[PDB]
C-alpha cells in the first residue's frame, strides 16, 4: 500500500470560516440554510438537529473533518451550536 | 400476406393458431383483422388478444403500445383490470434475463426502472379494483418488488461503505428508511448506517442506530 | 426443443415472486422515532382469495360479440346480453332456434311462448384447455326496450368430470355460447345479404369525371366489390395484367403488354400510348360509383388526354 | 410514390405531427396544410416547381387510402454569392468558408451547389465571426437578398453588408460576485498590449470563466460580456460582468441502460462522490473513464436540478450497453484423419460482473491446446486487479513412436496489476512454465540453442529430448488514455509487458515487448481519424545459455503485417542432414535428409526471431455506404503496413554462403484496405493487403479474415 493511487473522496458540504461565522443563536431555519446552504445530513429520528460535516481525504495524506452541529427547536428557532475544527 | 376471408374466418382463424399457440401466425391474423376492420364487434376482443399474444410472443414494447392504446381508448371497459395486470406483467418482464438467470445471478443490482414501473403499475390495479381475480398475484408481485429494489439500494450504501463515502451512505440508508421500512433489505442496512455514523465521529448518531438495531435484533 | 401443453396459460417467466420473504414491520425504540414513511410503496392489504402463480390464467377474456347485430352488448358475472337490429318482431325467436339446431344441440325445455330454454350438457373442443369442459345453459329472447334482445345464462362448467367456480371459465363458456348463436345468425344474414347482392347485377357505364383531387378517374357507376372483382378482367383485356392486388387496400399493379391496333380495337377503347413501366391503379367506394385513379411508373399520375383515349368505351372489357 | 430525394421515412415522421397516422380518422380541412407544409420543405431545399397534391380513395366500411403524389423538379443551383460593401477583404476569401458554394472545382465531385435556408442562415453567422475576430466590433449585416431565375432554377444570394473600423482591445473589466476566485479570473483575462479585439477570444474567456467556476460547485453562474466602443481612439473596453451563484452539492448518482452491468461495475469509476459538493471536471472523468471502459455503446450525463431545491443536482448517467465478447469457432478436419473442433469463448464482462473471462482450445488428432483466463479489475476498491491463467498445450502427431516430434507445455500464471495514476498502471507477477521436446529435426538455430544449454544432440538422427521447468516474474506498465474502449478517435495507448527467468530456473533469459496504439482526429466531428500502430520486441539469454527458441517474435498476419500469412515473416528453418529417421515412401521429408541431399539445404519454414519491430500507418474514413445510424457498428481504413523479424545471434561468419537473418535491413511491406464490424459473433475484420515488399519464403495472403480484436 501507499502506492495504489487513490483519488479524493470529498464527503460532506464545503464550509468556511467567514460562513461559520455568519450563523448565531437565534437564527431561523431559513436563514441558517440561506448562509450556508442546505444541510446533506439531518436527524432523521425525533430531533430538529442539521449536520454540517466537511470530510476530505486526498488519499494517503489523512483525513481531516469539521462537523458543524445545529440544534434548533420546534419552531425552528436555531438553539445550539457545535463547532468540531478537528477529528479526535 | 394474409387472405381477405370475411371477417368470422379470419376471426376463427385466429382463435385457432392461439390456440395452438402460434404465437407469430396468430399475431398476424389478428393485425390484419383489426387494420382491416378498425371499428367493428371484434375490436375489443382484439385488441386484447393481440396484447395477450405480444405479451407470449416476448414482443414487450409492442404489449405496451397496445395496452396504452387500450387503456386510453377504453378507459371504463369492464376488463381493464386485466390491462392493468398485463401491463404490469411486461413491465416485471423487462425487467429479467434468461442468460443471467440460468447461472444463478441475483439481478438486484441492475437497473431498477422497470421494477419500479412495474410496482406502479401492480399498485394501481390493486388499489382500484380490490376484487379483481388479479389482485393476490398482484400483491405477491408488489412485495417481491419492493424486495428488490429495496435491495438495489442496500447494493448502492454497501458500495459506497467500501469506498469510504459516509455521508452517501447515510443518506442512502435514510432513503431506505423512508421508502421501504418494511424490507429485509433495511434490516441488512441498518448496520451500516451505524458504521457511517462512527466513522463520522457522530455518536450520538451511531448510539441512536445501535438502540435501533437491538429494538429489533432480527 | 422440449415444449408441453401447459406454456400457453402461463406466464411467461417463474414462480420466483412467490418465495420473496414476506414484510415486517420495524419497531421504534422508546424515546425517539422513526424516519415518517414516504407511502410511495405502501402495498394495500387485499385479500389472497384468488389464484397466484402459473395457477392463474392470464388468457383474455372473453367478450360476447355483437356479430349479429351492432347493437350494445354485455356479460355481466355469469349471463351474456345482445340486442338485435330493432327487434325483429317475433321472428327472432324462430331465427335463434334454427340457428341452435344448426349445431344438433339437444333442448329439453321449451318455452316458445314465453321465450325461453334449456340446453342439455354441450360438450366442447378447445386445443387450450387440457382438460376439455363442458357445462348446460339457458337461452331466453326478452324485450329490453325498443329492441328485442337475446339473453343467455350459464348455468355450471364441469372439466375433469368435476364442478367449477372460477369466474374465469364461466365468462369464458357464456361469452362462447353467445358467440356461437350470433356468429350463426350473422353467417345466415351475411348470406342472404351476399344472395341479394349477386343477383342485384350493375351497369358497367364509365366516365371521366374528377374529384376534390383535380384529376380524372376512370369512374364506374357501380359498386367497389363488383367493379374491383370485373377490373382484373378488364385489365386483362387490355393487356395490363394484374400482378400485385389489395382489396382491403384499393392498390394494384400492372404490367405492360404489346396490344396492336386491332387488338385495340377488339377490346379496350384504344390505346391510351401507356407503353413503359410498371403502372399502378386505385379504386373507390361509392355504392354506386367507383373512381379508377392511375398513376404512371415515375410516380405521376396520368393525364386527362393520357385517359381519355381508353375512356371512350372502357366498358365491354369489364 | 414519385419521391425520389425526400425518404418515406421522414415523410411518415412528418404526417405523424399532422395527426394523419394509420388507424386514425382522416381530418380533411388539414389536408392543404400537410400539402403545403411539404411543398415548403421542397422549397427550403431548393426544389422549387416541385408540387406534393394529395389523392384520397374511399375503401369500404367508411375508410380511406392516403396516397401523397410527390412530383419533384429539378433542383435549383446557386449561380452566384455577392457580398456587396467588403473592402478590407475580398469576396473569394469570405466565401471560401461557406458551406454553400458558388462554384466547384473539377477535381472536386463530392459537393454541389444545392441551396438550404438553415446552411444560408449558417453561413450568414460565419462571415459575421470572420469580421468580428479581425477586431472590426462593428460589422453588420445589412441586409441579404435571395433571388431566384424566372425558370427557377438559377437562385441568386446577395449580401449587403458595413465593415466599420478596426478596433483594439483597450482592457478587460472583470467585475460582481466572484466567490473569492477573484486571482484565478485575472489570469483568465489577461490581454496583450495593442492586442485587436476578437469576438470568439472574448466567448473562450467568458466559457473558460463558466468552467472554472464549475470547478468548483457553482454549476449554475451567469457570464456576460457588454463591450463599450469608442470611437475617437477606436478602442474597445470589455466588461465581463460574473455572478457565481450558489455552490451546488450532488445528491444522488443515478445509472440508467445498465441491464446486464452491475450497479458498482458503473459506480466504481466515478469520480465524482454521491453525497458532496459538485464538480463540473470530476462528472466528466466519470464520464470519460465510462467510456475507456468499451462495457457501452454510448455515455451520456444530464445533471437535473432537485425540485424545489436551491442547493441540489441529480447526476444520471445514461449508458447503452455493447456486446463484450467474441465467440471464435471452427472445424477443420471434419472427417480426415479423425475429427478435430475449435472453441474462442473471451468475454470482457462476464455476466455484467466486470470480470474478463476467456475460455479457448483446440482439439485434434495431434494437439490438445487449452486455455483459461480469468481477471478481476477490481480486486480492491482502489482499482487492484488480479489475474489468472492456465494452458495446456501438447503435440504428439498421433502415432504414439519416435520421430514425432513430441512437444507437451503447460503452465501457470498469475498477475497483480494496480494504478499509479489517472491512466497508468503497473502490473507484476509469477510464472510457471513447463516445456518438453522430443525428437527434434536438426536445424541451425534450435541446434545452436541447445548447445547453448550444454546439451549435444546429434546432427544426424532425430532421437533426443529436452525437458524445461521455467518460473519466471513478469512485469507490465500500460499507459490508456483512448477516447473510447471499443472504436477510439483519440488519445493513445501504450502497453509494455516483460518477463525474466528468477534463478533457479532450468534455463535463464528475458523478454520484453512494446505495443502502441496513438488515433490523432483530423476532422473536428472525429469522423476522419490517422492510426500509428507500432510493436516491438527483444529478448536474449542472461548467462552463457540463450533465449528459448519457443519464445520467439513471429511477425506478418492480421495482427501485425496485414498480405503475408500467420508467423510467416523472419528467419527460416536451416536442416542439418538426416541420415536417418527417415521415411522414404511420406515424402513429407525436407531437403536435408537421407532421401535427398547431404548438405545445410536452406528450407522455407519460419522459425521466428529474439527481436521484432513493426509498425503501421492507418487512414479511419467513414463507411462509402452506411446508414449514420450504424455508423459506430463499422469501420473502414486504409492500411500501410511494415514489418521485421531478425535472429541477432545467428552467426554470419559461419553460413554464410545461407542468407544473413541478423540484418534488420530486411523489412517487409504492404497496403490495401480492412474493414471491420462488431457482428453478434464479436469483431469480424476483413482486409485485401497487396505485400508490394517480400523476400525469399515469404508467403503472401491477400485476403484475410479473423475473429476477435485484433489488437
Given amino acids: 500500500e501507499r502506492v495504489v493511487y487513490r483519488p479524493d473522496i470529498n464527503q460532506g458540504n464545503y464550509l468556511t470560516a467567514n460562513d461559520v461565522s455568519k450563523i448565531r443563536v437565534g437564527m431561523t431555519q431559513q436563514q441558517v440554510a440561506y448562509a450556508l446552504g442546505t444541510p446533506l445530513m439531518s436527524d432523521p429520528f425525533g430531533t430538529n438537529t442539521w449536520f454540517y460535516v466537511f470530510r476530505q481525504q486526498p488519499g494517503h495524506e489523512g483525513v481531516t473533518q469539521q462537523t458543524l452541529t445545529l440544534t434548533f427547536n420546534s419552531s425552528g428557532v436555531l438553539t445550539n451550536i457545535d463547532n468540531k475544527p478537528a477529528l479526535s | ?218 | 426443443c422440449s415444449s408441453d401443453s401447459r406454456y400457453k396459460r402461463q406466464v411467461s417467466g417463474d414462480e420466483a415472486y412467490l418465495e420473496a420473504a414476506p414484510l415486517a414491520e420495524l419497531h421504534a425504540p422508546a424515546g425517539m422515532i422513526l424516519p415518517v414513511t414516504s407511502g410511495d410503496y405502501a402495498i394495500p392489504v387485499t385479500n389472497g382469495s384468488g389464484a397466484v402463480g402459473k395457477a392463474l390464467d392470464i388468457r383474455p377474456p372473453a367478450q360476447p360479440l355483437a356479430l349479429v347485430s351492432g347493437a350494445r352488448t354485455q356479460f355481466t358475472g355469469d349471463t351474456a346480453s345482445l340486442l338485435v337490429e330493432n327487434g325483429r318482431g317475433n321472428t327472432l325467436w324462430p331465427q335463434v332456434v334454427s340457428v341452435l339446431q344448426a349445431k344438433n344441440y339437444t333442448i329439453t325445455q321449451r318455452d316458445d311462448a314465453g321465450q325461453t330454454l334449456t340446453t342439455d350438457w354441450v360438450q366442447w373442443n378447445r386445443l387450450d384447455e387440457d382438460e376439455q369442459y363442458r357445462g348446460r345453459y339457458q337461452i331466453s329472447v326478452k324485450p329490453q326496450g325498443y329492441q328485442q334482445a337475446v339473453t343467455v345464462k350459464l348455468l355450471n362448467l364441469e372439466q375433469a368430470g368435476k364442478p367449477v367456480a372460477d369466474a374465469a371459465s364461466m365468462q369464458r363458456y357464456s361469452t362462447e355460447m353467445m358467440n356461437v348463436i350470433s356468429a350463426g345468425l350473422d353467417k345466415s344474414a351475411t348470406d342472404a345479404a351476399n344472395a341479394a347482392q349477386n343477383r342485384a347485377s350493375t351497369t358497367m357505364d364509365v366516365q371521366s369525371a374528377a374529384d376534390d383531387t383535380g384529376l380524372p378517374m376512370l369512374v364506374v357507376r357501380g359498386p367497389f366489390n363488383v367493379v374491383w372483382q370485373r377490373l382484373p378482367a378488364a385489365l386483362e383485356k387490355v393487356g395490363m395484367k394484374v400482378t400485385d392486388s389489395t382489396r382491403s387496400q384499393g392498390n394494384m399493379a400492372v404490367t405492360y403488354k404489346p396490344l396492336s391496333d386491332s387488338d385495340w380495337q377488339e377490346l379496350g377503347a384504344s390505346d391510351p400510348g401507356l407503353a413503359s413501366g410498371d403502372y399502378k391503379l386505385q379504386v373507390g367506394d361509392l355504392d354506386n360509383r367507383s373512381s379508377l385513379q392511375f398513376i404512371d411508373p415515375k410516380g405521376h399520375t396520368l393525364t386527362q388526354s393520357q385517359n381519355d383515349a381508353l375512356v371512350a368505351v372502357f366498358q365491354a372489357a369489364f | 410514390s414519385g419521391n425520389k430525394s425526400v425518404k418515406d421515412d421522414m415523410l411518415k415522421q412528418n404526417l405523424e405531427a399532422s395527426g394523419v397516422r394509420v388507424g386514425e380518422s382522416l381530418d380533411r380541412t388539414t389536408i392543404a396544410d400537410i400539402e403545403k407544409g411539404l411543398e415548403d420543405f421542397y422549397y427550403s431545399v431548393g426544389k422549387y416547381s416541385a408540387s406534393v397534391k394529395a389523392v384520397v380513395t374511399p375503401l369500404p366500411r367508411n375508410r380511406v387510402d392516403l396516397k401523397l403524389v410527390f412530383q419533384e423538379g429539378v433542383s435549383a443551383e446557386i449561380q452566384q454569392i455577392n457580398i456587396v460593401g467588403n473592402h478590407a477583404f475580398t469576396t473569394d476569401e469570405l466565401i471560401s468558408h461557406f458551406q454553400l458554394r458558388d462554384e466547384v472545382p473539377w477535381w472536386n465531385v463530392v459537393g454541389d451547389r444545392k441551396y438550404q435556408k438553415q446552411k444560408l442562415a449558417g453561413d450568414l453567422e460565419t462571415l459575421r465571426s470572420y469580421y468580428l475576430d479581425r477586431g472590426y466590433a462593428r460589422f453588420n449585416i445589412d441586409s441579404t437578398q435571395v433571388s431566384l431565375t424566372p425558370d427557377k432554377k438559377g437562385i441568386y444570394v446577395t449580401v449587403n453588408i458595413t465593415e466599420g473600423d478596426q478596433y483594439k482591445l483597450s482592457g478587460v473589466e472583470v467585475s460582481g460576485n466572484l466567490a473569492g476566485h477573484s486571482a484565478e479570473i485575472e489570469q483568465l483575462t489577461k490581454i496583450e498590449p495593442g492586442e485587436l479585439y476578437n469576438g470568439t477570444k472574448v466567448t473562450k474567456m467568458e466559457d473558460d470563466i463558466k468552467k472554472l467556476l464549475g470547478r468548483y460547485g457553482y454549476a449554475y453562474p451567469r457570464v456576460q460580456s457588454m463591450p463599450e466602443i469608442n470611437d475617437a481612439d477606436k478602442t474597445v473596453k470589455l466588461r465581463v460582468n460574473v455572478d457565481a451563484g450558489n455552490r451546488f452539492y450532488v445528491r444522488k448518482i443515478r445509472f440508467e441502460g445498465n441491464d446486464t452491468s452491475k450497479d458498482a461495475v458503473l459506480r466504481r469509476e466515478m469520480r465524482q462522490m454521491e453525497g458532496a459538493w459538485l464538480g463540473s471536471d470530476l462528472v466528466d472523468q466519470g464520464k470519460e473513464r465510462l467510456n475507456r471502459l468499451g462495457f457501452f455503446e454510448t455515455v451520456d450525463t444530464d445533471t437535473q436540478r432537485v425540485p424545489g431545491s436551491p442547493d441540489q443536482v441529480d447526476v444520471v448517467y445514461k449508458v447503452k450497453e455493447r456486446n463484450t465478447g467474441s465467440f471464435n469457432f471452427g472445424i477443420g478436419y471434419g472427417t480426415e484423419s479423425g475429427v478435430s473442433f475449435q472453441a474462442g469463448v473471451q468475454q470482457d464482462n462476464w455476466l455484467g460482473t466486470g470480470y474478463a473471462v476467456g475460455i479457448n482450445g483446440t482439439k485434434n488428432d495431434y494437439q490438445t491446446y487449452a486455455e483459461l483466463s480469468v481477471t478481476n479489475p477490481y480486486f480492491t476498491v482502489d482499482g487492484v486487479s488480479l489475474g489468472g491463467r492456465l494452458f495446456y498445450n501438447d503435440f504428439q502427431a498421433d502415432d504414439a513412436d519416435l520421430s514425432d516430434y513430441t512437444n507437451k507445455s503447460y503452465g501457470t500464471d498469475v498477475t497483480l496489476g494496480f494504478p499509479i495514476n489517472e491512466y497508468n498502471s503497473l502490473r507484476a507477477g509469477l510464472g510457471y512454465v513447463h516445456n518438453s521436446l522430443s525428437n527434434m529435426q536438426p536445424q541451425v538455430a534450435m541446434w545452436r540453442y541447445l548447445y547453448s544449454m550444454g546439451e549435444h544432440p546429434s546432427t544426424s538422427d532425430q532421437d533426443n529430448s529436452f525437458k524445461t521447468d521455467d518460473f519466471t516474474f513478469n512485469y507490465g506498465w500500460t499507459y490508456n488514455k483512448l477516447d473510447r474502449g471499443y472504436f477510439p478517435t483519440d488519445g493513445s495507448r501504450v502497453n509494455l509487458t516483460g518477463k525474466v527467468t528468477i534463478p533457479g530456473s532450468d534455463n535463464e533469459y528475458y523478454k520484453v515487448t512494446l505495443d502502441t496504439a496513438t488515433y490523432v482526429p483530423i476532422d473536428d466531428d472525429h469522423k476522419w481519424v490517422v492510426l500509428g500502430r507500432t510493436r516491438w520486441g527483444y529478448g536474449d539469454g542472461l548467462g552463457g545459455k540463450e533465449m528459448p527458441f519457443y519464445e520467439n517474435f513471429y511477425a506478418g498476419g492480421s495482427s501485425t503485417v496485414r498480405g503475408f500469412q500467420s508467423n510467416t515473416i523472419g528467419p527460416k528453418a536451416v536442416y542439418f542432414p538426416h541420415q536417418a529417421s527417415n521415411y522414404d515412401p511420406d515424402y513429407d521429408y525436407e531437403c536435408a535428409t537421407q532421401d535427398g541431399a547431404k548438405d545445410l539445404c536452406k528450407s522455407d519454414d519460419a522459425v521466428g526471431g529474439n527481436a521484432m519491430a513493426v509498425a503501421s500507418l492507418e487512414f479511419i474514413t467513414p463507411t462509402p455506404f452506411i446508414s449514420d445510424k450504424y455508423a459506430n457498428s463499422v469501420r473502414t481504413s486504409f492500411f500501410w503496413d511494415m514489418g521485421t523479424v531478425w535472429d541477432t545471434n545467428w552467426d554470419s561468419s559461419q553460413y554464410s554462403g545461407y542468407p544473413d537473418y541478423s540484418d534488420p535491413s530486411n523489412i517487409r511491406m504492404s497496403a490495401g484496405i480492412a474493414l471491420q464490424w462488431m457482428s453478434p459473433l464479436g469483431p469480424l475484420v476483413f482486409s485485401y493487403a497487396q505485400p508490394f515488399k517480400k523476400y525469399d519464403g515469404d508467403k503472401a495472403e491477400q485476403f484475410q479474415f479473423n475473429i476477435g480484436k485484433t489488437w
Fill in chain 2, 1 to 218: 400476406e394474409v387472405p381477405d376471408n370475411p371477417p368470422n374466418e379470419i376471426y376463427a382463424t385466429a382463435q385457432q393458431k392461439l390456440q395452438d399457440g402460434n404465437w407469430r401466425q396468430a399475431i398476424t391474423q389478428l393485425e390484419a383483422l383489426d387494420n382491416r376492420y378498425p371499428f367493428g364487434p371484434y375490436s375489443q376482443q382484439v385488441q386484447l388478444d393481440l396484447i395477450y399474444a405480444y405479451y407470449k410472443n416476448a414482443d414487450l414494447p409492442l404489449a405496451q403500445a397496445a395496452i396504452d392504446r387500450f387503456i386510453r381508448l377504453n378507459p371504463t371497459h369492464p376488463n381493464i383490470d386485466y390491462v392493468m395486470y398485463m401491463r404490469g406483467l411486461t413491465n416485471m418482464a423487462l425487467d429479467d434475463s434468461a442468460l443471467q438467470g440460468f447461472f444463478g445471478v441475483d439481478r438486484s443490482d441492475r437497473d431498477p426502472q422497470h421494477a419500479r414501473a412495474a410496482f406502479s403499475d401492480f399498485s394501481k390495479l390493486v388499489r382500484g379494483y380490490p376484487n379483481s381475480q388479479y389482485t393476490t398475484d398482484a400483491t405477491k408481485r408488489l412485495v417481491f418488488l419492493k424486495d428488490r429494489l429495496a435491495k438495489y439500494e442496500y447494493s448502492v450504501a454497501e458500495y459506497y461503505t467500501e469506498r469510504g463515502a459516509w455521508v452517501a451512505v447515510v443518506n442512502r440508508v435514510e432513503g431506505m428508511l423512508r421508502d421501504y421500512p418494511d424490507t429485509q433489505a433495511t434490516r441488512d442496512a441498518l448496520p451500516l448506517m451505524e458504521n457511517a455514523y462512527r466513522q463520522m465521529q457522530m455518536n450520538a448518531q451511531a448510539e441512536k442506530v445501535a438502540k435501533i438495531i437491538a429494538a429489533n435484533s432480527s
